[PDB]
Every structure is written in structure tokens, then in C-alpha cells.
Amino acid sequence: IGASLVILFIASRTIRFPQVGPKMPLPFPALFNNPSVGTVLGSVSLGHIVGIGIILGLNNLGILK
Amino acid sequence: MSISDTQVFVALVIALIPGVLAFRLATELYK
Amino acid sequence: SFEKWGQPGHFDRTLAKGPKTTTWIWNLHALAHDFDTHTSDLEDISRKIFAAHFGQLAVIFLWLSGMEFHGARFSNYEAWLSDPIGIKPSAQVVWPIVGQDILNADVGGGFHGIQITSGLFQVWRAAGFTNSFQLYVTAIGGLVAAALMLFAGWFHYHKRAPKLEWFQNAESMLNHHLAGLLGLGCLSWAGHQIHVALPVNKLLDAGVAPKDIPLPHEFILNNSLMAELYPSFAKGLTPFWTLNWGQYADFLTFKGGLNPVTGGLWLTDTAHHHLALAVLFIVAGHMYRTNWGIGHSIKEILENHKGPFTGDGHKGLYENMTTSWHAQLGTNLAMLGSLTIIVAHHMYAMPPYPYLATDYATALSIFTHHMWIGGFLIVGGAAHATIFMVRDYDPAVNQNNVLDRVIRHRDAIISHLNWVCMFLGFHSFGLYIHNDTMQALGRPQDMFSDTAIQLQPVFAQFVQNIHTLAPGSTAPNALEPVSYAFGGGVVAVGGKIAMMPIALGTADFMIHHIHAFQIHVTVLILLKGFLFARNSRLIPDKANLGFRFPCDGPGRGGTCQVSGWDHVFLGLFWMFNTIAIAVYHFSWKMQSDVWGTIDPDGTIAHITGGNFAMSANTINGWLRDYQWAQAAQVIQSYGSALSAYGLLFLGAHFVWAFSLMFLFSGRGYWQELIESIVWAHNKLKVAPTIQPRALSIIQGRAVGVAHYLLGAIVTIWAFFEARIISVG
Amino acid sequence: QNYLLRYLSLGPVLLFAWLSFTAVLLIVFNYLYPDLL
Amino acid sequence: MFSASFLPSILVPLTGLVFPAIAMALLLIYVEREDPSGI
Amino acid sequence: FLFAGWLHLQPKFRPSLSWFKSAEPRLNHHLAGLFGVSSLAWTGHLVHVAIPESRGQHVGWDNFLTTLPHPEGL
Amino acid sequence: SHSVKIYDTCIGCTQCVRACPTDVLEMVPWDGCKAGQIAASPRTEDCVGCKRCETACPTDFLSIRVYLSNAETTRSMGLAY
């Protein structure tokens, strides 16, 4: 479920300090609760990817219910 | 079951990595 | 606007004045493109390169569309459609006049012409091509796109030409190309495949009325027939919305082997292949830093990798990769060459088109063609590397770098290299002639095959073995081995082999070793010219004087042939040898123990009969048991309707000897003969005003080597073309 | 204008022109009466 | 015996005898070295 | 591990005497991250490999990725 | 080493003296033409056989020649080893 996606996303983005390149947190900002936006779209999309890997790891059986 | 020339193999993994690694770790301390 | 062409020498100030002697003609065809030799500016250079690229693409489109058009109106495709076995494709029908009338290549169904060998119909057995009118439209589209992008080049040079910072964004370059070009094109082609290709492939199993088979418009929004097969392909069930992909086991599968109903592999694997590649290097090509303040600062990566033996690592390399052009040229050429030859070395064990292993004519033609191009251009890559060395460098930005660290200890490198080459060279060839002598000396027990003194390449055998049983454990979700030359069952169709496991006995050893030998000496020559390009132990003015010059006088004895492109001359001779014996080996093995006919028992009766274990060990056998077969028909292969093409093999020898004439001789002799003929002509008042002058020695060397190569390659292609015609 | 020949008369293009003219010349006599020996 | 080769037949003596021999020989000549170098 | 021992002999890899005197980091790292996590890993090897082999089921280095410790698992 | 040969056609442009990398030439005082100083070879022993010099001589039938002898040595052969 998308929950885990946003969880790992913000875990990688906002609850911590990434050294991500030039550390830019405001290429272009947005608002959900208190974000630093401009790269969050890419972070979210790889979040999609890691969730995809998790779920087809879970493929056999798991949290579907 | 048991093994073959693969034991010559497992011998071959030695005498380069562990051998001269231990050799250097020995000779570091100036005989 | 036409007042401008007939003003020759428009790009050079020297040869623009007038043609004093014939020399003025020659240089006209020599400096027409190196416009780096015209100014110091760069934007002009880049614009010229863009326009030239557009022109090359235009001629590409032109020739491909024209070849199509010939395939539509003068090729027996749509008759060969229903039967790809009992009919041999053809094109280029012969014009009925004196001289070319008996050459009617009749391939059944009365269709005369020329029995071609380029396997485009094979693509046209996968693209599912029914009627030639759609193909007519295809050619029209190709040619109009050609003209279109040519007009685009004209515009982008004469009206709106790009600026200079538009050059060196290699980051966006890689991103755009890697992702957008490759991934989008590949996924689009895969989408075309699944929609049309495999449907008509299904429909090519039992004679399902090809033209009667519906058109793609009958499947754009008509999902009913698309729901006939692949129940999950109702619409798609669109379970990707639900992240579930188990339904799609219908078409998007993984078989990995030969499909004995198509003459090629299972196309579904290729489709899923293309999908995976597409997304894989899409997410790859999304790497580098660009306009959003996120990414690798790539000029700092190479700064980091240094250490004790490194010196200072890869510091200072981008000035070379962007300020200069010949660098990029050379490296990309080398890489393309290698890639091409592995392609050649690749697609004879995994045929990716329908009716490939069952068609024993197009295979080696494609193989040898690509293989020749590979080397023939990697040497050019090395040449442009050398031309970079002489044209572009810097004493300042090249302190102790991994580059400079070799140019300081070149002598040890090249000495040890020479050592290796000598070793391998005689260690192989003298061994060979030793066995030759022994066989000629009634001492057969001193031979070296299995029936005599032993040597066995266990490494190849063991790697092939560990490849044989790969699926299940290493490849659980995989059905058959990747190929069948390593291991598996002998896959075939009809009385005609498709692929059997290949055997490596004793003869493989020295063959591979002499391959390595010649590659070593080739590298030796080329790298030697590379390092000893600017300064030799005797000539400290090379780069101070150029890289295209004949000699430096009879000082120190002789010094002729001390430039670099003569090094690449010798190198191209050697690579000729390499690739020639390579294609010899490949053809002989894959006609000796891989190809032939088959019986109902799967009994492979090969063409020759396994001649390597018998004669491919001594020299006299190598001429006997190869060219006896490779010519015994070409002598008489002329003299009837589908034979009249008296081949220019008889003709190529002449150009070969005429070639070698240019090499052995100087020029002053020809100059004096010229002066005598001039005396005579002047006596009869016919003296040509433009005074003829003999060729320059470098010019003569060039024409000699050109004619040499031409004659040799013409000879050999004639050889095996007629040889395959004798069996295909 | 008619200046094109000023820039079409180069020799080489004129070579092939004359040679092809002579070639089709040789053809037509070999095309019309190749039956006189 | 088993699936291995002869090796356990003759690889003990050199380790048993000759390697100790060179060991002690080198050692003895080491314990008499001159100054100030020594190997 | 031998090579690791060798590396710290090189000059740029010489730890500090204060780096030796500071105890509490070594304390925590050992009494938590030396065996606590290590006994956790041993427990994982137990429920993933040891108990199955006790119960007769073979779980190699590849089948462990797809099969479960418990049907009520997770 | 080898022998050098001088003539009268030396105009005196002195392109040869700037071309020989072997220091075997000098313009000794002359009187005949506007040259007043004609080239000559004082230090033949370092001759190399490159003969880049007469290629720098513009005079019709270039004024200098080199008679390439037979008494070669390590100097005339030019070896660093």
C-alpha cells in the first residue's frame, strides 16, 4: 500500500539531512504539512520503485488484506 | 559426495591472499 | 543563387590561385574536409559537422527507400511469401540486351533476375508484409524524410545556426540520448511487435490466407480478435493498475531457445527483452546533473580515484574530451569497431529473425561483412588517437596524470611487448612447422592431435560445461539453455541443421593462440606509433614537424617511414591477415562439423566430414583441404543460364599485381620517363601546358596499399560467395 | 540565368557528359543493327 | 584411499624435515649478524 | 581481516590515543552491537534454517528467499 | 665525417645556417656579390646526413652540396647508446 511509499520517502527526504549533491531543498517548493520540495518528486518516484520491489518480494503472500 | 581437483583449487586460493598477507603482517615489525 | 560553385579552392588560400602543375589537382581531393586546417574557430567547425551528418542521414534514407522500391516492383517476395523454403529470393531483374540476357536468375515461378543474398525478406517475414503498395508508401516516406532533414540542415546552417555553449553539455547529451532516444524507440518498436508481429506470426503457421488476414486498423480498437488469444489480453485486464502482472503470462514470457516452427527463436522473449532494456537504461540515463541542481559533478568523480600507484589519478581529462574532437572520434570508433565484431561473433548462435539457421546463405555474408567493417574501422580509431596525440595535448594540464605516467616509461612496456610477441609467434608457428616436418618425415607419432602428443584446452571445456546445466538453479525462471552450441539437444528442422553443440579438441589450441599472436603484434605496431609519435630516441622534432611526411634524409643511415600513419599501414596489413584467417577458420568449422544435411534419425551428414581432426594440423593440408573445395567449381561455375556470372576473381589477381608494382618502385625513374615523353610531345607541338609530374611517394604508397586491399578482399568474397552458391 | 554553364563547365562534369554521350552513341549502333559481320 | 590424489603420501617430509632445517639454519646465521644491518 | 590489520599500519590510518581512551562508545557498541545484534542474526539463522532442517525440510541458499518460517507468518 | 661542398651561388639569405641542427656552418667574410659573407663548413665532424640545409637553399642549383662519405663513427651515426 502507498503508506510505506510515503513513509520511506519522507524518511529519506525530510526527517533527515541528505547530502544530496548541492543539498538544495528549494528548487521549487510545495506544501503538504512541512516539506522541502523540488527534489521530492524524484524521491517519491524512487519510493514508488522500492515499494514495487518490496511488493513483488511479497508476491508469494503478505499484506493484501 | 567427496571431492576432486577442486581440492587443488582450495589449495590455490591460499599462498597468495592469506600467504603473503600474513607475510606482510609479520614483516611489518622489523625483524 | 548559383553564382558560387565553379570557384574552386574556395576553402584554401594557396590552391585557390591556379593549377600550375597536376599536383594542384591531387590536393583538391585531399583537404576538402579537414577544416580544422582552415581557421582556429570552432562554432563553424561544429556547424559543418552537423550539416555533414544530416547529408549522410539523407543518403541513408534515400538508399534504403530505393532498395525497398526495388523489393516491391522487381522482387519475388509475395510469391516467396507462401513458401520461404522452395523459393530463393531475388531482385534486380536483368535487362534484355546483348551481354546480359543469359543471366536470368530464375528462382521458380518464372521470376528471373538476380538471386540476392541480404536477407531483407527475413525482416519482411517478421514485419508481416503482405502487399507491395504499403512498401511503396514506405519508400515515399523515407525519401521525403531524407529531403526534409536535408532542408533542415540547409536552414540550420544558412538561416539559424546554433551557438557555441550549445556544444559541451555532455550531461544533457547522455541523459536525452540514453533515455529518450534509445528507450522510447525500443519500447515503441516492442509495442509494434506485440500488436502486429506475433499475431501474424501465429497466422503464419498453417497457411492462414496472408492478405485475407486483417490489417492493423482491424486491431487498433477491435479487441475481439485480440481477446481470442491471450485471455488476459481482453483489453489488458489492465492489472497494472492493480500492480498484478501474473495475468500477462500469455505473451510476455521467457522461453530462451529455438522455436522449430519459425526457423528462429521465440519472439516473445525478444519483446520482453526490449521492454526490460527500455526501462532499464531509461532509469540509467536519468543519472547525471542538469538544470535542476541535482546530480553528479562528473569532473569531480575522476578527481577522487587516485592512490599510491596511481600518482594523481584521472585528474584533468575533460579539456581533452571536449576542447578537442579527434579524441572523441578515436575512442568512439574503437568502441564501435569492437562492438560490431562481437555482434558478428554473436548472431550465428542466436538467430533473432525467422528462417535464419535454416537459410545457409545470408549467415556468413552478414557475419563476414560486419566482421570486416569492425577491424577496418577500429584501426581508424587508433589512427585518430594518434592524430589527437600530434594535434592536441598540453604540457600544463598533464602533470603526472595516469596519461603522462606511461609516456615516461614507454620503453619497458614496448620491450616486454616485443618479448611476448616473439614468444607467442614462434611458440605457435614453429611448433606448427615442426609437426609439418614430422608428418613429412615418417615420424607420425610426433604429431600433436589426440592420436598423438597431447594438449587439451580444459578451460573452454569447463566453462562450456558450467554453462550447459545453467537453468533451474542459476536460471530457475528459464526453460532452455541460452544456446545449443554449449549444451542441450541438437536443434534442427527438416534435413537441415539449425544448431548442434560444437566440439573443441586439439586443433583449437594453436588457432586461438595465433589469433592472440597477431592481435599482439598489431597492438605492438599501433601502440608503438602511438607512444613514439612526438619524440623518438633519435628524432626529437616529430611533433615539431608533423605526422604525415615521408622521411628525414639519409641521416643515421636511413630514416624513411618514420611517421605514424606508415605504422598504421603496417598495422592494416597485419589486421588483414588476422581477419582473413579468422574468417577462414569460422567458415571451415561451421561447414565442417556444424552444417550439412539431416536424416530422419536426426543424422547430421555434414558438408565436408570433419576435416580439422584430419588435416587442419599441417600446412600442406591447409591448402589442399580448403581451397580444393573452395574453387573446384569456380573454374567451371560459368556456362549456362543461372551460371553465366563469370566472376572477377580471375580479374582481381590483375589488380593485385598492379598493386604490388606501385610498392617496390621509387619515383625518379617515372619522372625521367615522363620527361622523355614530354620531349617527344614538345617536338610535335602538343606539349600540355599543365606540366605533368609523377606521384609523390606517399601518394604512391597509398594507391598501392589501396589496390592491394581491394584485390585481396574482392578475391576472397568471390571465393566464398560462389562456394555458398554451390550449396545454397 | 544562363550563368549556370559558367559554373557547370568544369571539365570533370564535362568529362562524364562527353563519355556518356559517346557511350550511348556506341550503344545505338549496337542496339539498332548488331547483326552486321 | 579416497578421491584425493597422492598428496598425503609425500608432503610431510619437507615440512617435517627440510623446512625446519632451513628455518634453524637461517635463524642461527641471523643470531650472529654484523652491525648495523641484518636480514 | 589480516589485510585490515595491515592497513592501519600505514601513516594516514593511525588511530589516536584519545580514540583509545574514550570508553562509552566501545561500551555501547560492544554490549549492544557486538552480540545483541549478533544473537539476533543467529536467531534469524535459527528460524530460517535451523528449525526447518530439524523438521526435515531442506532450505538452501536460494529457496530461503521465497518460503516462509511460519504459515501464519507476518 | 662526411664531406661538405661550397660554391659561389650563395646569395646570402642564410636559411641553411638556421636549418642545420648540427652546427657545421658559418658565414665567413666574402666580397663578390652583395652577400659579403658566404656560408662554409668549419665543423664537418658533426655532419649527420639529414641534408635539411640545401632544402633551405633557395638558389637555382642550390649553392651547397654534401658528398656523403664512408668514414662513419658513433658521432656521424648518431647513437645515444
Ligand SMILES: CC1=C(/C=C/C(C)=C/C=C/C(C)=C/C=C/C=C(C)/C=C/C=C(C)/C=C/C2=C(C)CCCC2(C)C)C(C)(C)CCC1
Ligand atoms: C544499425 C544500423 C542501421 C539501423 C538503424 C536503426 C534501426 C535505428 C533505430 C532507430 C529507432 C528505432 C529510432 C526510434 C526513435 C523513437 C523515438 C526517439 C521516440 C520518441 C518518442 C517520443 C518523444 C514521444 C513523444 C510523445 C508522443 C508521441 C505522444 C505525446 C506524449 C509524448 C510527447 C511523450 C542502419 C540500417 C540504418 C545502418 C546500418 C546499421
Ligand SMILES: CC1=C(C/C=C(/C)CCC[C@H](C)CCC[C@H](C)CCCC(C)C)C(=O)c2ccccc2C1=O
Ligand atoms: C606509375 C607510377 C608513377 C607514375 C605517375 C603518375 C602520375 C601516373 C599517373 C597517370 C594518370 C594520372 C593515371 C590516370 C588514370 C586514368 C584511368 C586515365 C584516364 C585518362 C583518360 C581517360 C582521359 C609514379 O610517379 C610513382 C611514384 C612513386 C612510386 C610509384 C609510382 C608509380 O607506380
Ligand code: SF4
Ligand atoms: S647556401 Fe642558401 S642559405 Fe646558405 S648563404 Fe647561400 S643562399 Fe643563403
Ligand code: SF4
Ligand atoms: S646533413 Fe646537412 S644540415 Fe645536417 S650537418 Fe650535414 S650538411 Fe648540415
